[PDB]
Design a protein around this ligand. Structure first.
Ligand code: X1J
Lengths: 412, 412
């Protein structure tokens, strides 16, 4: 039957740093990775800032010759994938390669790449479209390229479920191992949507904070002055591993993955139900899946996108699932500092959640100066809060009424 | 032990018709759906033909208002999903809605919408980007929109595994049911990449047939004159159902899905290994999953893309897997008539594999006028072949070395 699943490796690019420890240091210090965007000219855009990955050197991972053929999202996913695999100390052999797979996803994928070849197509013509446009841009090629580079011959796929992609990717990889389709999976996601179509598209839908004159205070989840999410780039990857396999080889285990929930809201293409009915169903499935009393949950890492409707939905979802225990746990949004990595949001927040467990600290919600109507839970405003965390939960919600929950606990 | 999964409903948009019975009539008569592409200037392109969905009326499915928000690939996916659900006679209720989920995917997604919003971005700047650009273009919106429209609250997600997408979607939907996460799933894929960026993308990699003089003859898997694949558009969708839930409501069962294989080649970003190592591993994994010996397999719907390296690698794979049984089974490429629907290839080709079981006939590989070196198997050249079929394989292989196999068995 169902095997248990532990975290043996983590890798990350965020607007807070080029690895996990540097990113985490910023999280505990309540530092913002949000700044005006420099790689393009956004004077015609209603939003001109985001969470860029700053100082990324792809030639720490790939030959410039390969890197040139690949969209930044693919570069970011490989960067985090390679970190996580090295962090696991796992050796890939002919003996285990067929039992090691990969599920790295993206919400949008190679939008910069499609934008640039679109430029070439319209300004010059079809014959200037790169021969590398398809394999360098489509979402499954983080899983593809990682498998080619490392010899991973296990299950090879990618999810695209918008802002839920990282949680879905991690959770379903765990089910791969749980049910014995694999002993190891590299799982998470990557996003680089900070191009014309991305900032314009989200801008057109009026979803983005337009606080161009103070980018670091734009992402203010549950604050009454919130005006949309902040668009950020990066990657999260975890090495998920069957528990006995991890023990046999003496792997360092950060935490166990005990619970995964999915659920459609069936409510609206882009709007979350104000009652949190979808988040509620999802967390309930995931806590059942983990065989837990909801009162065991100590820390929740919220979706916490800093949109009006999304944030309030999540208070209502947590009050409804946890009843009075909603006032005992701590809930925070690391999106306060990183902004919204979209399909990678689930991945980086999975790792922040595992790190709350290791270090016994609730990350802060920075910029929560004036909590909104009903937002009366412990939201770890401003400053990290050292506390007892046995069980941590990470929530994601996306367009299509798509929901995911991951439940982690300490392994000893 | 594990719940059994059956097919109770099927839906399709293809170059051979706007539904399954019309597509299947096409298939068994050896008709081509390939023609010069219209309503689009391909003067500057090396390929000017493909498999277009001819005569599609989205308003049979959606309001004009709904449909104007959504890329053709999503319209195609919804059409297939709606056909399939209706074909199943499933009643969605408050009692069962949490146990009905969706896994509809795409290889490439919303190229045509990205192209048109790009046209507007480059000519007039970002204030001409549709506010429905993002949710109207991202790959999870077939699953999103279907779930919202039918009120489905089960597992809500999408796969994107290039030309393997449709197969992976159906396969991992089947897993959700087997391991009791859902009782019903709508699964498959949709694709409409016949924009400048698709034909130009694949054209730039010289992956496409350039036989503009005889478009019906361009797709010729295992023929010595083949010169790359034909780009085709459309959708497949299956209603997957746990057996006891099918029988309890007196569902018409087309066939049972007994076996699912995934596997990475870990070989090359675009190229398959010459010896079908990947396809071999994947078919072996799928037959082991089904608890079947290779001698039990009667019909294989090949990937059969009409690429020099792709077609011959599949011959290698089958010979390696089926040894002294490889000439006994019939193996045909329906891409000989449909061309390559990319991420929807696996969905439509799963349906054709189910109807091969229902009607006891192997669909032809048309245009196999001169089989290449080593292509001495029963590739059902030119005409449909009635024969005994108890076990059917549908193989899919994609960029990133991503493999998928589905094993269907007759039900009586
Ligand atoms: C043409 C056809 O087969 N259908 C099935 C179906 C199901 C639901 C909705 N909204 C619309 C339609 C149209």
């Amino acid at each position: 039957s169902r095997r248990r699943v532990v975290i043996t490796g983590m890798g990350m690019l965020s607007p807070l740093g080029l690895d996990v420890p540097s990113s985490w240091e910023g999280i505990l210090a309540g530092r913002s990775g949000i700044a005006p965007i420099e790689h393009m000219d956004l004077s015609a855009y209603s939003t001109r800032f985001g969470g860029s990955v700053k100082g990324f050197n792809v030639e720490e991972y790939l030959s410039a010759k390969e890197a040139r053929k690949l969209d930044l999202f693919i570069q970011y996913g490989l960067a985090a994938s390679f970190q996580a695999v090295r962090d696991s100390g796992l050796e890939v052999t002919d003996a285990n390669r067929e039992r090691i797979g990969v599920s790295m996803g993206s919400g949008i994928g190679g939008l910069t790449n499609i934008e640039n070849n679109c430029r070439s197509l319209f300004e010059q013509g079809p014959r200037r479209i790169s021969p590398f446009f398809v394999p360098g841009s489509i979402i499954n090629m983080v899983s593809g390229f990682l498998s080619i580079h490392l010899g991973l011959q296990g299950p090879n796929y990618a999810l695209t479920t918008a802002q839920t992609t990282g949680t879905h990717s991690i959770g379903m990889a765990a089910r791969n191992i749980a049910y014995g389709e694999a002993d190891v999976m590299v799982a998470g996601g990557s996003e680089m949507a900070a191009c014309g179509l991305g900032l314009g598209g989200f801008g057109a839908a009026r979803a983005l904070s337009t606080r161009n004159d103070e980018p670091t205070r734009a992402s203010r989840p549950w604050d009454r002055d919130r005006d949309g999410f902040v668009l950020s780039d990066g990657s999260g990857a975890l090495v998920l591993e069957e528990l006995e396999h991890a023990r046999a080889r003496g792997a360092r285990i950060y935490a166990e993955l005990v619970g995964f929930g999915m659920s459609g809201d069936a409510f609206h293409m882009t709007a979350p139900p104000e009652d949190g009915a979808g988040a509620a169903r999802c967390m309930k499935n995931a806590l059942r899946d983990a065989g837990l009393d909801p009162r065991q949950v100590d820390y929740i890492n919220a979706h916490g996108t800093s949109t009006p409707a999304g944030d309030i939905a999540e208070i209502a979802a947590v009050k409804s699932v946890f009843g009075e225990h909603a006032h005992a746990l701590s809930m925070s949004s690391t999106k306060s500092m990183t902004g919204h990595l979209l399909g990678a949001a689930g991945a980086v927040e999975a790792i922040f959640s595992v790190l709350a467990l290791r270090d016994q600290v609730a990350p802060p919600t920075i910029n929560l100066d004036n909590p909104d109507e009903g937002c009366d839970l412990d939201l770890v405003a401003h400053e990290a809060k050292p506390r007892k965390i046995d069980v941590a939960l990470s929530n994601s919600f996306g367009f299509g009424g798509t929901n995911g929950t991951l439940v982690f606990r300490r392994f000893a």
